[PDB]
Amino acid sequence: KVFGRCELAAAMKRHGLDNYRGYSLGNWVCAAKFESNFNTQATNRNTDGSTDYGILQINSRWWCNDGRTPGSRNLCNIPCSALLSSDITASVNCAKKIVSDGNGMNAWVAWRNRCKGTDVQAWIRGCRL
């Protein structure tokens, strides 16, 4: 599923992402935009052989099992395919655990390089929340 901007904001809000560990909703939407272009089925292969999955491009190195990242962990205890679902529940719950792990949203390289410090509020402007 390819979400609309305001549609994703609402689903992120419903799932408790707005101000989760102090990150306003617009941070999350900006992250999703640049990670996946709001496409729940986005995947991208990393050079180390791990893979990023779904709306927030959650990495198999630590967070999900895809059965093909030697030595990796599955800290969200999910198959990485759960992160490609039209329902973002699994992605959001796993994101909550990632953003809690000490570096906040800097765990997402695209958030740091493209959202961090920007007017992230623009990403929820006009949305009925």
UniProtKB/Swiss-Prot annotation:
In the egg white and polymorphonuclear leukocytes. GO terms for biological process: cell wall macromolecule catabolic process; defense response to bacterium; defense response to Gram-negative bacterium; defense response to Gram-positive bacterium; killing of cells of another organism. It is an enzyme of class 3 (hydrolase). SMART domains: LYZ1. Disulfide bonds join C6-C127, C30-C115, C64-C80, C76-C94. The active site is at E35, D52. Its EC number is 3.2.1.17. It catalyses: Hydrolysis of (1->4)-beta-linkages between N-acetylmuramic acid and N-acetyl-D-glucosamine residues in a peptidoglycan and between N-acetyl-D-glucosamine residues in chitodextrins. It comes from the Eukaryota. GO terms for molecular function: beta-N-acetylglucosaminidase activity; identical protein binding; lysozyme activity. Substrate binds at D101. The keyword Signal applies. Its main location: secreted. Pfam families: Lys. Keywords: Allergen, Antimicrobial, Bacteriolytic enzyme, Disulfide bond, Glycosidase, Hydrolase, Secreted, Signal. GO terms for cellular component: cytoplasm; endoplasmic reticulum; extracellular space. CDD domains: LYZ_C. It is found in: Secreted. Coiled coil: none annotated. Monomer. Lysozymes have primarily a bacteriolytic function; those in tissues and body fluids are associated with the monocyte-macrophage system and enhance the activity of immunoagents. Has bacteriolytic activity against M.luteus. Belongs to the glycosyl hydrolase 22 family. Lysozyme C is capable of both hydrolysis and transglycosylation; it also shows a slight esterase activity. It acts rapidly on both peptide-substituted and unsubstituted peptidoglycan, and slowly on chitin oligosaccharides. PANTHER family: LYSOZYME C (PTHR11407:SF28). This is Lysozyme C. It comes from Gallus gallus. The gene is LYZ.
